[PDB]
């Protein structure tokens, strides 16, 4: 009620307060509890191997220096008071570019408690690197992590734990990635040892499964239909040299046009992707089909037998190629 | 233990401290030891001729002004105390854009020692230029360097050395470039003389070898198959004017479509790349194949002999072209 009385209490807490010194300095390490409320996962970039995350990052710790008496309320102070208070040197190890929103003000919350408990909340948009194994692409499963660690203070000075156990991270179900689906999320607490010493570590990992629907319609179906369209040449009479030859290269031309567009949307990974194997395999089949007519024309100038053998073999071989390919990557 | 006693000690060190003056001012140059812990190499851009590097940059030096007694501990202070302490004017000569991460705070570490030793660590994401010799592209080897130098202080005032010898730089093995492989890294210490005087220099260089797997499948194989597909015209009977002519330009059309997509991913370098020579060479062969049928049709209206000579020569010449090309660039 008495604003002046509250003002005097806050000034008393800040008087002589040393931001440079952690709570319980020279004593037991301060336990910091962290909970994360995910707002959204804006982007997941395969070319840059990173994802953009927006979240409400909150930290809980006890500072006896900030304990106050006579005020049975939780003091929600202005965000500018955080500059006069000690906060953990929490940083993300795998982040590439992060910032705190400042509209209309810095999205920062300081909430004090009579016993000295401090609540520190930040709305952070971060871009964290995520190495992706694209061997099974686009049927791959990705495990993107978010590493949380103290920069300077070791385990002797500070400790990290998930506040609420497995409930420390919420809002996962609200995430709606156009290309991925959040299979599962895991919370890991561990200690990482460096040359300077051991540091506390908190890890938040998402298992992302890519949606196959877009690629099946966009990429696989045109490739299959062109390859089937190449088999039409076998039905065409052997004397129709102009027709069968024109069917050949145009199918080859069509396959190249499909191949040029598809490979652009991905980084240059030396290993063979599932999409890489399928596109090249189809391009070989149409290449062999035109070669098949070459042999037919040459021997003609048994010729029916070669065409008949080609007709039985090609759909069977392509079906066998599809069966082996799908089983390998599924 | 006594936070007030530690606070008084820190205030005593900062009292009368002059940030404008280096340690041992007017005396022997201050030796600064540097060690780098690489976090990741995010990007390597051929078009911009630069790479993005994230690392933990640490500096070691002795400042007798900051020596303290009676506290047998290493004081890990808040990162904001670095503004009140002298730090070397270390800058990167070849960098194009660099910044220090500030989430949740400035990724900066200050660690004092009783004898006056100061540890200054920074997590820096830097974009450093790297001139690339692309004559042997994509079978080229690149030597990208990171130049470390003092801006204002000469060798008379400051000196640089790698702390730990060849172990000063770590984390190289963890780097996973999708397009390159880290063959080797080297540490170089030298003095660079300018008009204003001689300055200490530290150089960190990476030898990058490009992965050839992506380009072999994406670019070379389609070009080879189209050229082989053009040789099919020789088997086709000479009277099939519509078939052989249609095979010719369509192969030429296919080669142009491949050429248009491939050259986009690279800067305009006047010299001939290995990929440049191969694409143009294949385009000449298909051009000659259609010219070959022109001569055949004209003389027909020996004609069999011209086709037979063409059949022997073309695969042999193309194989010879491939053999010379691969030996030159491997």
């Amino acid at each position, epitope marked *: 009620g008495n604003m002046s009385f509250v003002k005097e209490t806050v000034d008393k807490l800040l008087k002589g307060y040393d931001i440079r010194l952690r709570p319980d300095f020279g004593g037991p390490p301060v336990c910091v509890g962290m909970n994360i409320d995910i707002a959204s996962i804006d982007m997941v970039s395969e070319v840059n191997m990173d994802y953009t995350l927006t979240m409400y990052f909150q930290q809980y710790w006890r500072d006896k220096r900030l304990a106050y008496s006579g005020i049975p309320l939780n003091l929600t102070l202005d965000n500018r008071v955080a500059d006069q208070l000690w906060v953990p040197d929490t940083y993300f190890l795998n982040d590439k570019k992060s910032f705190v929103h400042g509209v209309t003000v810095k999205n920062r919350m300081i909430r004090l408690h009579p016993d000295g408990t401090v609540l520190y909340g930040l709305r952070i948009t971060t871009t964290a690197a995520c190495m992706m194994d694209l061997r099974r692409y686009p049927l791959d499963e990705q495990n993107c992590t978010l590493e949380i660690e103290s920069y300077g203070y070791t385990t002797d000075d500070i400790e990290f734990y998930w506040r609420g156990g497995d409930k420390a991270v919420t809002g996962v179900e609200r995430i709606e990635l156009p290309q991925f689906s959040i299979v599962e999320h895991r919370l890991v607490s561990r200690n*990482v040892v460096f040359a300077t010493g051991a540091y506390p570590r908190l890890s938040l990992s998402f298992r992302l499964k890519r949606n196959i629907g877009y690629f099946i319609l966009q990429t696989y179906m045109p490739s299959i239909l062109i390859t089937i369209l190449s088999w039409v040449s076998f039905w065409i009479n052997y004397d129709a040299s102009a027709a069968r030859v024109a069917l050949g290269i145009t199918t080859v031309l069509t396959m190249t046009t499909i191949n040029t567009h598809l490979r652009e949307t991905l980084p240059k990974i030396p290993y063979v992707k599932a999409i890489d194997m399928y596109l090249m395999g189809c391009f070989v089949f149409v290449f062999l089909a035109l070669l098949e007519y070459a042999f037919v024309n040459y021997i003609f100038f048994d010729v029916n037998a070669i065409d008949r053998w080609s007709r039985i073999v090609f759909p069977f071989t392509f079906s066998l190629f599809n069966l082996v390919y799908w089983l390998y990557y599924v | 233990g006594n936070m007030s006693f530690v606070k008084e000690t820190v205030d005593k060190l900062l009292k009368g401290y002059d940030i404008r003056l280096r340690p041992d001012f007017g005396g022997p140059p201050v030796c600064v030891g540097m060690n780098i812990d690489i976090a990741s190499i995010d990007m390597v851009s051929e078009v911009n001729m630069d790479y993005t590097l994230t690392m933990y940059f640490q500096q070691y030096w002795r400042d007798k002004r900051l020596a303290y007694s009676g506290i047998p501990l290493n004081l890990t202070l808040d990162n904001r105390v670095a503004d009140q302490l002298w730090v070397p004017d270390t800058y990167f000569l070849n960098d194009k854009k660099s910044f220090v991460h500030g989430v949740t705070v400035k990724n900066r570490m200050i660690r004092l020692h009783p004898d006056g030793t100061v540890l200054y660590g920074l997590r820096i994401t830097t974009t450093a230029a790297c001139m690339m010799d692309l004559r042997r592209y994509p079978l080229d080897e690149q030597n990208c360097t990171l130049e470390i130098e003092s801006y204002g202080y000469t060798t008379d005032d400051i000196e640089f050395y790698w702390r730990g010898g060849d172990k000063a730089v770590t984390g190289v093995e963890r780097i996973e470039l999708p397009q390159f492989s880290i063959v080797e890294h080297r540490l170089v210490s030298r003095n660079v003389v300018f008009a204003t005087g001689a300055y200490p220099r530290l150089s960190l260089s990476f030898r990058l070898k490009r992965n050839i797997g992506y380009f072999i499948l994406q670019t070379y194989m389609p070009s080879i198959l189209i050229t082989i597909l053009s040789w099919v015209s020789f088997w086709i009977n000479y009277d099939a004017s519509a078939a052989r002519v249609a095979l010719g330009i369509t192969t030429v059309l296919t080669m142009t479509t491949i050429n248009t997509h491939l050259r986009e991913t690279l800067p305009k370098i006047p010299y001939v790349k290995a990929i440049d020579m191969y694409l143009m060479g294949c385009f000449v062969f298909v051009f000659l194949a259609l010219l070959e049928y022109a001569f055949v049709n004209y003389i027909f209206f020996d004609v069999n002999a011209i086709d037979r000579w063409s059949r022997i020569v073309f695969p042999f010449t193309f194989s010879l072209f491939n053999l010379v090309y691969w030996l030159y660039y491997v």
Partner: nanobody, 121 residues
Framework: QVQLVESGGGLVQGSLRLSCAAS????????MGWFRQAPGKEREFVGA????????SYADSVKDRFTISRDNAKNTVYLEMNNLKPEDTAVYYC??????????????????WGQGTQVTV
């Protein structure tokens, strides 16, 4: 989950090649390190290699004598030991390290460990 099995370590007085087979989500643990634990002593670092890339790191005691190589297709890490010395009598272990597990020299940072082969020379 990663399962590590190491083999190829016998009793000799010499060049030896130790192979460590891996199975599971090996991509999430791209760094493989070799550790030996002499009786009455703490487990000692030998050499740590990455599954991808192939860059190497070795301890000073075994530098230029032990060489390690790996191949992702085989999913196996091969440790080649040459010029054996009597101090090399320890149980050799194969361990996998997460990408963000910190320092290589500390066995605590490694999550999955092999059974351990007893080699006496």
């Amino acid at each position: 989950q990663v399962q590590l099995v190491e083999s190829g370590g016998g009793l000799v007085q010499g060049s030896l090649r130790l192979s460590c087979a891996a199975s599971g989500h090996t991509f999430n643990y791209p760094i493989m390190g070799w550790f030996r634990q002499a009786p009455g002593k703490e487990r000692e670092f030998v050499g740590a290699i990455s599954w991808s890339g192939g860059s190497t790191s070795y301890a000073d005691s075994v530098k230029d004598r032990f060489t390690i190589s790996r191949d992702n297709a085989k999913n196996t890490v091969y440790l080649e030991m040459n010029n054996l010395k009597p101090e090399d009598t320890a149980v050799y272990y194969c361990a996998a390290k997460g990408r963000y597990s910190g320092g290589l020299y500390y066995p605590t940072n490694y999550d999955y460990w092999g059974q351990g082969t007893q080699v006496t020379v």
